[PDB]
Amino acid sequence: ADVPAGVQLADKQTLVRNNGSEVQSLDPHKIEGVPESNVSRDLFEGLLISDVEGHPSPGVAEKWENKDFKVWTFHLRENAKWSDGTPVTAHDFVYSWQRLADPNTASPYASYLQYGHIANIDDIIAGKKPATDLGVKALDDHTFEVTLSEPVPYFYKLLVHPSVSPVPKSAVEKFGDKWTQPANIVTNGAYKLKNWVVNERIVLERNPQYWDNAKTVINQVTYLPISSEVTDVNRYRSGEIDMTYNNMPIELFQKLKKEIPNEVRVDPYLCTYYYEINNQKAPFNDVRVRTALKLALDRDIIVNKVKNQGDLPAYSYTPPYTDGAKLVEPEWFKWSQQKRNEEAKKLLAEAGFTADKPLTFDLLYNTSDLHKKLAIAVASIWKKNLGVNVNLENQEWKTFLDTRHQGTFDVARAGWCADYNEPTSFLNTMLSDSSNNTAHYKSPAFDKLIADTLKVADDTQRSELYAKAEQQLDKDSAIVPVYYYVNARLVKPWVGGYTGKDPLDNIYVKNLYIIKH
């Protein structure tokens, strides 16, 4: 943290953050969500990290070079250490990226190495070549070299993500899935794990072996798993919580902006809220059905009437303000809702649905005040606008993500936030073989468009190709875009260091501080 000249620090440097749900895991290779990544950033540090405004910056690697954007060489700082005092080396990165790639690990983010195009990853994922053939090597203990199969000028932007953080081989090998328990875990970020009580709290304490430890200010941070946005606000206003999770309750938000204006933080956020359709399950394998659902949903009602927190109605997957997005807004978004409603009804009637034999399916969502209220609203809108019946189902966060991966669903609420600021952080999750493809969408035409993006060495050709890929996705109605998020949360006035400038919201507790109050 960089404490401004003249700020008075609190005697007690402790923080309590709400984190939305119980995490899937603390193992960087077994996680895919925001709550998971929030804790991961304090415990495990990769080659690069985001600074306080979100720019990619030195992490374990203090400097790096590239040759033709295909061979990337990272020079690791000599004093990077694990919490047990042992050196972080380039060998730890070799072991870790191979473990991520290994199909036996079954990481939801195995495809992050395909997104960066690390040599031989397709064959490793497919079981055709062993994980030790991955194109990474330690040239010495402090030098990590990555070889890609084609030029990727934004490659280094990928490296702040938890999936490419190091994991300690000896703990993994000795303890298996219990390696992340407090008694067994070893970490290289600013913090160490002190306590982990499922569905109660995760408590982290400063890691004195962290190379940048002298600049760490917060001594202990607690992450809570509260999924009720009402409860989070209540425990924030009672004094227990210093920073809520960034999901705000419909019940209280309008009141909060008039009661504590200065605590309500609302900033740009590169995330998209949508209804994920299971594209491989009948009758959702019929484009008419998907298009009808997409068109009949009234975004103006959801965004400005029922939620009204500053979100923007969405017509694409990739947020339009992503660095490198130059998207074409489809004509259906400019129509009136009435005209969208008639087109929808026409397509469903064309697909075989009648008043006698209507369309009925499930709408799955993760336990939450906000998502339940939006799902009830969407169910009513679809009932009234298109004659469809929906059965709402809630599941806890970890279970909900597993259900989507299993494909044991019809339609699911969903949100995707960028891992790196560039359109393929979204678009690569819809590739036929992506490990992140919970939509179960498989389009050779879409796949081809993205493959072509690294076959040109031109930024305008790439942007035009991203735009065409979004059009192909839209043409197929793979999903139902609802809104682009804003990052709204409450932050006590005494929490310093949270700028709200990072559109990825990659917060590190090592950057915060508590002002005397």
Curated annotation (Swiss-Prot):
GO molecular function, one term: peptide transmembrane transporter activity
Pfam family, any one: SBP_bac_5
Subcellular localization, as worded in the UniProt entry: Periplasm
GO process terms (BP): peptide transport; protein transport
GO cellular component, one term: outer membrane-bounded periplasmic space
Observed phenotype of the null mutant: Mutant cannot take up cell wall peptides.
Key words of the record: Disulfide bond, Peptide transport, Periplasm, Protein transport, Signal, Transport
SUPFAM superfamilies, per database record: Periplasmic binding protein-like II (SSF53850)
Induction: Part of the opp operon, which is constitutively expressed.
Highest taxon in the source lineage: Bacteria
Disulfide bonding pattern of the chain: 271-417
Other comment: Isothermal titration calorimetric measurements of the binding of lysine-containing peptides of different lengths to OppA show that the dipeptide Lys-Lys is bound with 60-fold lower affinity than related tri- and tetrapeptides (Lys-Lys-Lys and Lys-Lys-Lys-Ala, respectively).
Function: Part of the ABC transporter complex OppABCDF involved in the uptake of oligopeptides, including the cell wall murein tripeptide L-alanyl-gamma-D-glutamyl-meso-diaminopimelate. Plays an important nutritional role and is involved in the recycling of cell wall peptides. Binds peptides containing from two to five amino acid residues regardless of their sequence. Also binds cell wall peptides, such as L-alanyl-gamma-D-glutamyl-meso-diaminopimelate.
Assembly description: The complex is composed of two ATP-binding proteins (OppD and OppF), two transmembrane proteins (OppB and OppC) and a solute-binding protein (OppA).
PANTHER family (alphabetical): PERIPLASMIC BINDING COMPONENT OF ABC TRANSPORTER, PERIPLASMIC OLIGOPEPTIDE-BINDING PROTEIN-RELATED
Family note: Belongs to the bacterial solute-binding protein 5 family.
Protein name: Periplasmic oligopeptide-binding protein OppA
